[PDB]
Amino acid sequence: GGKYRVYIDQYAKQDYFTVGYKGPNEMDAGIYYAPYVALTPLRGSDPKNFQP
Amino acid sequence: STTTNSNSIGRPNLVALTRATTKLIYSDIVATQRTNQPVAAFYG
Amino acid sequence: YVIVGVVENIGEKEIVGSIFYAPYTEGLDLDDPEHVGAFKVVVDPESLQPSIG
Amino acid sequence: AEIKKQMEAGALVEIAEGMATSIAELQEGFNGSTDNPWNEMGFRIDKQVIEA
Amino acid sequence: QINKWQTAVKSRKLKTGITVELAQDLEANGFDAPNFLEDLLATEMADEINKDI
Amino acid sequence: YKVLEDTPFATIEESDLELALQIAIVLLKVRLFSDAASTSKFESSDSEIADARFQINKWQTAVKSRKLKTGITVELAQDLEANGFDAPNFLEDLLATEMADEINKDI
Amino acid sequence: AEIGGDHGYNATNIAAGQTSGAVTQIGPAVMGMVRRAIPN
Amino acid sequence: LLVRYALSANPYTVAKDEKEARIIDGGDMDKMAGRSDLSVLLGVKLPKIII
């Protein structure tokens, strides 16, 4: 309706909808996802056999 | 009545860091020069 | 205890004292070589965390 | 079907959780620990053949 | 007469090992984590050198 | 510690084991064993390397308060001026001084 | 080896910056705050 | 006038109760008192002044 952003729960188990609010200010969230470290790669190899 | 009993604090100020380590003095105790070989041999 | 002793340096070679320490750094490629000694980092192949000595 | 009914009922519900740091940090025998390998994955590459 | 006093250089070796999570917490808490580790080992070693001397 | 002379402590009458040891060091019966390792110790392919360790603990306290009050009757304040004093500054100095003194006492 | 360790997920200990590991924290600091909205 | 301050004990000052802890109350003189290596006290026994 030009009002609600609709997203598909591609893995929904039964059949349902959830209506939610989110403001322009992230503090007005309801629920937060607050990353600290994102995908740090770690690399090495086993010196015994040198496989990475 | 709003007092400091209501105020909730984010974090304390860490103010100062102290590392308790030995003052290391050997420089004024042992005469020394670098060795550039696996074995040193001084002449008497 | 109380101990006394000598540290003298009369130039070039005339270095005198008890216990010469005399560190050996030759052969190491050192940053700030006055440091005396070298660091190595490995990083485990099981855990992937660092290990430094 | 029974599980979905319990989910609808709110008796047993969908969840996902991050790992405790105290466990994740010492995986793969760190600091004398044991029986704690990382979860892992890769790929196959299989083949299919036809004829005229 | 000229006599000589000789000895091989001997070694000292230290390791710490700081997890990546610990290094990250140290940075978050205001510590220079990569230099912190090196200072820990360098300081501990230098102290052990003084004990030995 | 390392033994330099056999049956160390045979000749040390000191009963406090810690001091008997200090005596053994002075008398060269025993020497501090602290020393660098022969290089073979750490190239063996199985090498126990002493661990360096650390710990960071914290100390914390709340900020607390001190408070002083004087108050000067208007007529008394007027009298301070009449008597040769700077009345509003006399008062700030009085309170400031009393507080500074109490801080010094506390410390 | 030294570790970060973790919290017991006990908000008391969290607020205090306590860990089972090597380094005690200053504190969570601030992720912002929410002030209740005023009605119209 | 109002004055405020913490007047706390320095790190490594520890009460012989907790003995080892991650967080130490830097105040709490009731436990912290007498246990610090950054200051050492010796009292002095003197004859009295005649008044």
Swiss-Prot record, chain B:
Membrane-spanning parts: none
PTM description: Proteolytic cleavage at the N-terminus by the prohead core protein protease gives rise to the mature capsid vertex protein.
Family in the record: Belongs to the Tevenvirinae capsid vertex family.
Function: Capsid protein that self-associates to form pentons, building the capsid in association with hexamers of the major capsid protein and one dodecamer of the portal protein. The capsid vertex protein self-associates to form 11 pentons, building the T=13 laevo capsid in association with 160 hexamers of the major capsid protein.
Subunit text: Homopentamer. Interacts with the portal protein. Interacts with the major capsid protein that forms 160 hexamers.
Descriptive protein name: Capsid vertex protein
Source organism of this protein record: Enterobacteria phage T4
Lineage: Viruses, Duplodnaviria, Heunggongvirae, Uroviricota, Caudoviricetes
Stretch of the intact protein here: 11 to 54 of 427
UniProtKB/Swiss-Prot annotation, chain D:
Changes after translation: A proteolytic cleavage by the prohead core protein protease gives rise to the mature major capsid protein during virus maturation.
Transmembrane segments: none
Family statement: Belongs to the Tevenvirinae major capsid protein family.
Function recorded in the entry: Major capsid protein that self-associates to form hexamers, building most of the capsid in association with pentons made of the capsid vertex protein and one dodecamer of the portal protein. The major capsid protein self-associates to form 160 hexamers, building most of the T=13 laevo capsid. Folding of major capsid protein requires the assistance of two chaperones, the host chaperone groL acting with the phage encoded gp23-specific chaperone, gp31. The capsid also contains two nonessential outer capsid proteins, Hoc and Soc, which decorate the capsid surface.
Record's subunit section: Homohexamer. Interacts with the portal protein. Interacts with the capsid vertex protein that forms pentamers. Interacts with hoc; one hoc molecule associates with each capsid hexamer. Interacts with soc; this interaction reinforces the capsid structure. A total of 960 subunits of the major capsid protein forms the 160 hexamers.
Protein's name in the database: Major capsid protein
Source species of the chain: Enterobacteria phage T4
Gene label: gp23
Shown residues within the full chain: 210 to 261 of 521
UniProtKB/Swiss-Prot annotation, chain E:
Post-translational modifications: Proteolytic cleavage at the N-terminus by the prohead core protein protease gives rise to the mature capsid vertex protein.
Organism domain of life: Viruses
Family, similarity comment: Belongs to the Tevenvirinae capsid vertex family.
Role summary: Capsid protein that self-associates to form pentons, building the capsid in association with hexamers of the major capsid protein and one dodecamer of the portal protein. The capsid vertex protein self-associates to form 11 pentons, building the T=13 laevo capsid in association with 160 hexamers of the major capsid protein.
Subunit structure, interactors included: Homopentamer. Interacts with the portal protein. Interacts with the major capsid protein that forms 160 hexamers.
Protein name: Capsid vertex protein
Gene designation: 24
